[PDB]
Amino acid sequence: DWVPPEVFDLVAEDKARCMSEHGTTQAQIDDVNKGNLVNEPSITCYMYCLLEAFSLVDDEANVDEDIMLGLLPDQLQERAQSVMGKCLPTSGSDNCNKIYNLAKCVQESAPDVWFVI
Ligand SMILES: CCCCNS(=O)(=O)c1ccccc1
């Protein structure tokens, strides 16, 4: 992807901790990236965890859209803003479910945009 290699070390520790906390496998992360998302806490709570770690969402999974936009290439920022227009605010039964709903909304609307590290 566009995702530059310097992010993967930026995220490394948070990734390990989030996967550990949530019972997440790499296989599940791979699936979300190839389009396949289910409402399983091991993956949905992983995405919430990682978003939180980078201050992209609050304690109720409200998305900080400015921070979110500022971590994207200006190439995408346009298309991202468009997708957040549609898919924000978040809604759901809990923080994990809220991010499931968001991922799903983005994936349907913009395939290029919802990547998971
Ligand atoms: C727009 C898609 C956000 C969800 N992806 S992510 O949670 O893996 C993530 C990506 C980049 C930084 C932090 C978390």
CA distance 22 to 5: 24
Q: Which of 54, 116, 109 is nearest to 87 (CA)?
A: 109
Rounded Cα distance, 75 and 88, in Å: 20
Closest CA to 101 of 27, 58, 31, 47: 47
Resolution, in Å, please? 2.3
Number of domains in the chain: 1
Residue holding tokens 């566009």? 2
The answer to whether 99 and 47 are in contact (CB under 8 A) is: yes
Find out whether the beta carbon of 54 lies less than 6 Å from any atom of ligand 1.
Answer: yes
Task: Please report, for the domain that includes residue 116, its CATH number.
Answer: 1.10.238.20
Q: Which atom of ligand 1 is nearest to the CA of 3?
A: 11
Q: Which domain holds residue 22?
A: 1-117
> Half-sphere exposure (CA, 13 Å, Cβ side) for 36?
6
For residue 4, the SS3 value is coil
Q: 72 exposed, middle or buried (CB, 10 Å; 0-12, 13-18, 19+)?
A: middle
35 φ/ψ sector (left φ>0, alpha ψ -120 to 50, else beta): left
Q: State if residue 80 touches ligand 1 by the CB under 6 angstroms criterion.
A: no
